[PDB]
Amino acid sequence: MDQTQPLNEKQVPNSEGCYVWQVSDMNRLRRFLCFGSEGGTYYIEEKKLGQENAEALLRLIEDGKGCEVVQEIKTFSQEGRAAKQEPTLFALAVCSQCSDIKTKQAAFRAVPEVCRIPTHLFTFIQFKKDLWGRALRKAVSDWYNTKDALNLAMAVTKYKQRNGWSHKDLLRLSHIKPANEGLTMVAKYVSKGWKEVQEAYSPETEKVLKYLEATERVKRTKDELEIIHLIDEYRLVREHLLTIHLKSKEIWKSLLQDMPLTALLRNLGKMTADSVLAPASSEVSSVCERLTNEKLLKKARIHPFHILVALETYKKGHGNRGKLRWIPDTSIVEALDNAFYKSFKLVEPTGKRFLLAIDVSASMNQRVLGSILNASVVAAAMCMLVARTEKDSHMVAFSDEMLPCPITVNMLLHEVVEKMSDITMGSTDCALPMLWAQKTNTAADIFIVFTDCETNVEDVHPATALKQYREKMGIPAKLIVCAMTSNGFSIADPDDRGMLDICGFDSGALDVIRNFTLDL
RNA sequence: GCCUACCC
RNA sequence: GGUAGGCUUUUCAA
Ligand SMILES: [Mg+2]
């Protein structure tokens, strides 16, 4: 009996013909929220991946899980555990339509806590289209009227329109009625324009006009000094400036001052190139100190993935799609690579013995989140995270055989990246870890395997490998399968309480692994 | 092959 | 359509 055969009825065949279990729908929801379905997986095409995921979603609703889904969606977004928003917003959209009315009413109810910025809403509304009314009109209206005039003003000027949707269309389609003078002004500004509003017009309301005026002013003035001035006075950001100003060193030195974190993160390369982040500079020193402030990273909801993508591209001196070059600053590379570990919800060590196994087979070459990072690299990063928290941990890599582990606990993130480079390839034997462990008489209480569960060699089933391990070593060893995709497969036996299914790249992954290690 | 802003 | 920034995919002051 090997992986080519089913252990029991419950099991189903992979994408390779070998047998595994089907991840619980709830768990697949999490996989989906974190990885989405762009580019699909190594075996499943993008389109069918989304279809497989859409099916599981509806299945949950069918089964009553309607409100648990929204609650989970609501929680992942607020806690910022998912790199990108599309999957969450698409999920909240499907729920916003499902048969259940409990779920639907819960979906629109959570819209303002999930759609924090215009883009989020625009993407939500567009999804509803790919799939107005009382609920919709109400939800959109509440999004604006519950805000503070002065805040809405920034929101609507920072994000005038995204993906084909403007606040002008939303305001009109929802037939909103400004809850106060401040909001009517902003609304009039949006639908009718500055002139109309300027022509039509409290201390609080004046503040709102002032601002709107500022935003209009920084687009007519030729004087750079005045631009810089307004930026200082009204905290105007990049989106507020005419793109011709974005070539001025002094504009950015003024823009960097209190630049939001994602903005700062996505423009590290450009600022270095324009000498705004010159070597040894105060500015650079400032940047590093901000990127490594866990609280602000947390406040700005900087996901570790975004850090990884920026680090990879930043040290490359040049972009992937971009077309500018810069001498990568070593202080920044050390600050980003440091920030990576602070972006995850950190936890107190348990002290247990962990065996961390990275699936490095050919399939792990598959690209994640439509980025330039592959599952191999991401799995290794997640691995480094768990290894720097629980010191008693031995890392190992595998494909269809045990391979010398290319990385170490003391390596900087970009060294672990290129090392996974030279080694990703081969077939998949997901039982090797447990098997290796027994053979080297290596003790462990927890096994964490970072895989896509597409095991395919004629060797015993990983679940079988774990049992043989328990019996042989006399340890109740548990097994945590950290998923690297949104496929619906798992080498984890649902009937074994010592086997858990978690998602890779959930900034909250650390807490789940802990709760499980500690029998919670 | 894509995102924005400005003019038209 | 013309022009200009950027692509670390859409820039979460939070
Ligand atoms: Mg493989």
Side-chain angles (χ1 to χ4, degrees):
Chain A
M1 151 75 41
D2 58 354
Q3 313 173 194
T4 64
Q5 305 180 93
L7 266 181
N8 62 49
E9 323 111 350
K10 315 186 183 189
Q11 294 209 241
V12 300
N14 327 306
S15 291
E16 280 294 43
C18 292
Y19 289 70
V20 297
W21 280 287
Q22 185 165 186
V23 147
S24 88
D25 292 332
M26 262 312 194
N27 281 236
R28 198 178 183 176
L29 171 69
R30 296 188 219 144
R31 293 185 169 185
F32 181 62
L33 290 179
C34 296
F35 299 116
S37 20
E38 313 183 76
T41 76
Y42 185 72
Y43 306 92
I44 307 155
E45 275 301 338
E46 192 182 68
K47 176 183 171 195
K48 180 184 176 187
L49 222 205
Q51 280 185 294
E52 277 186 27
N53 285 92
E55 296 174 319
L57 182 35
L58 288 120
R59 217 172 302 131
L60 291 173
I61 300 169
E62 268 328 43
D63 309 301
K65 293 292 182 268
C67 292
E68 199 194 312
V69 167
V70 172
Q71 180 59 30
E72 195 69 13
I73 286 177
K74 196 166 175 265
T75 300
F76 258 73
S77 178
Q78 294 207 13
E79 299 183 60
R81 0 208 343 237
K84 303 214 211 186
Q85 300 298 236
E86 282 56 307
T88 357
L89 295 176
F90 176 71
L92 201 147
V94 181
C95 285
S96 120
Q97 318 216 182
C98 68
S99 40
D100 207 48
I101 2 83
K102 230 346 183 23
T103 301
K104 248 194 305 190
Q105 136 189 61
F108 296 103
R109 190 173 65 224
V111 162
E113 303 190 71
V114 170
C115 297
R116 294 176 288 285
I117 63 173
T119 312
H120 290 165
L121 229 200
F122 294 151
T123 292
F124 170 74
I125 257 120
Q126 170 65 334
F127 271 147
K128 289 197 60 44
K129 192 176 179 215
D130 298 310
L131 297 172
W132 282 26
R134 196 77 247 43
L136 230 206
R137 296 211 224 214
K138 188 198 187 310
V140 171
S141 301
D142 286 69
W143 194 89
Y144 293 85
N145 288 213
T146 63
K147 255 105 183 291
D148 344 315
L150 188 61
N151 276 75
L152 214 246
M154 328 198 293
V156 300
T157 47
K158 182 172 183 175
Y159 311 81
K160 291 194 127 209
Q161 66 71 45
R162 299 286 125 111
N163 321 130
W165 291 88
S166 82
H167 298 100
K168 189 177 189 151
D169 307 294
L170 301 192
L171 252 40
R172 188 227 323 154
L173 291 185
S174 53
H175 301 354
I176 186 183
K177 6 182 161 159
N180 70 359
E181 188 110 67
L183 285 165
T184 298
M185 185 190 284
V186 171
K188 187 167 302 174
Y189 169 88
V190 169
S191 9
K192 300 262 246 348
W194 181 227
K195 290 52 184 84
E196 253 208 328
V197 106
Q198 197 183 194
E199 164 63 11
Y201 292 80
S202 161
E204 226 339 72
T205 309
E206 246 307 71
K207 271 277 193 76
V208 176
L209 179 68
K210 272 293 210 173
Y211 182 83
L212 279 170
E213 174 187 48
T215 45
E216 279 314 319
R217 195 84 188 158
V218 22
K219 298 216 209 176
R220 305 300 162 174
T221 185
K222 290 294 202 200
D223 186 359
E224 239 188 300
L225 270 302
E226 187 183 1
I227 292 185
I228 288 180
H229 230 199
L230 292 178
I231 294 181
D232 272 39
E233 234 194 286
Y234 303 97
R235 274 249 274 209
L236 302 177
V237 293
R238 204 188 66 269
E239 297 81 337
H240 287 300
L241 280 44
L242 290 176
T243 136
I244 19 217
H245 301 135
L246 273 359
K247 210 103 186 190
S248 150
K249 196 203 210 178
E250 289 307 315
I251 295 292
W252 290 87
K253 281 191 156 187
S254 147
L255 238 31
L256 179 69
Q257 207 114 234
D258 275 37
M259 192 169 299
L261 285 188
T262 289
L264 164 54
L265 193 63
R266 288 188 57 172
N267 293 287
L268 282 176
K270 159 124 180 137
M271 283 186 212
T272 303
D274 290 76
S275 261
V276 358
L277 274 180
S281 68
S282 209
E283 303 49 324
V284 167
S285 182
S286 194
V287 164
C288 299
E289 213 127 358
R290 298 188 57 200
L291 292 167
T292 62
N293 188 308
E294 197 212 23
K295 290 328 303 169
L296 307 186
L297 283 173
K298 250 289 201 58
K299 193 190 175 211
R301 299 212 225 296
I302 303 303
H303 191 80
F305 160 92
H306 296 316
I307 306 297
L308 209 185
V309 174
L311 185 132
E312 232 303 293
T313 298
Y314 188 63
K315 55 149 173 174
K316 254 189 171 66
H318 60 61
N320 173 168
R321 277 146 148 134
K323 301 178 183 175
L324 297 81
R325 302 182 136 114
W326 59 76
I327 302 176
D329 187 278
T330 311
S331 227
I332 308 306
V333 178
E334 178 232 18
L336 285 180
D337 136 58
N338 212 149
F340 179 82
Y341 295 111
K342 299 184 190 221
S343 29
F344 292 90
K345 284 150 188 173
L346 315 174
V347 299
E348 303 271 358
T350 67
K352 271 33 171 164
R353 300 162 299 175
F354 299 77
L355 187 289
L356 312 182
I358 303 174
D359 183 327
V360 284
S361 56
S363 53
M364 296 302 281
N365 231 99
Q366 58 204 250
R367 259 122 140 115
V368 238
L369 306 224
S371 75
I372 292 172
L373 298 167
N374 62 38
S376 204
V377 186
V378 160
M382 281 299 280
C383 187
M384 285 284 283
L385 178 68
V386 157
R388 327 223 329 195
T389 299
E390 308 293 336
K391 270 60 178 191
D392 194 71
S393 51
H394 187 294
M395 306 178 293
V396 298
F398 74 90
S399 52
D400 61 62
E401 76 175 297
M402 294 299 287
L403 281 310
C405 192
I407 54 179
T408 56
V409 207
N410 299 299
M411 295 174 125
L412 296 162
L413 243 121
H414 94 187
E415 183 178 358
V416 354
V417 174
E418 100 191 87
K419 298 242 187 302
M420 301 315 281
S421 241
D422 312 87
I423 153 184
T424 304
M425 63 184 74
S427 300
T428 312
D429 187 0
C430 293
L432 297 178
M434 285 63 89
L435 291 180
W436 172 81
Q438 182 200 307
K439 260 230 142 208
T440 14
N441 186 52
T442 294
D445 306 288
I446 305 300
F447 280 2
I448 292 187
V449 183
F450 298 83
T451 179
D452 55 15
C453 298
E454 300 275 31
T455 187
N456 62 297
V457 308
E458 300 166 332
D459 198 48
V460 302
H461 282 272
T464 298
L466 182 60
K467 290 182 169 292
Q468 286 182 174
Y469 179 84
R470 287 144 134 140
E471 299 173 300
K472 193 30 119 48
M473 305 293 290
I475 300 178
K478 300 167 173 133
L479 173 66
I480 294 183
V481 225
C482 186
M484 296 302 303
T485 72
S486 67
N487 68 284
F489 310 129
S490 173
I491 59 176
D493 192 323
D495 297 317
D496 186 312
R497 50 174 289 214
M499 287 186 242
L500 182 66
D501 244 39
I502 73 164
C503 179
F505 243 92
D506 169 354
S507 25
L510 246 37
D511 229 48
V512 236
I513 296 171
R514 177 153 174 291
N515 289 336
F516 193 73
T517 293
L518 298 177
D519 283 359
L520 309 183

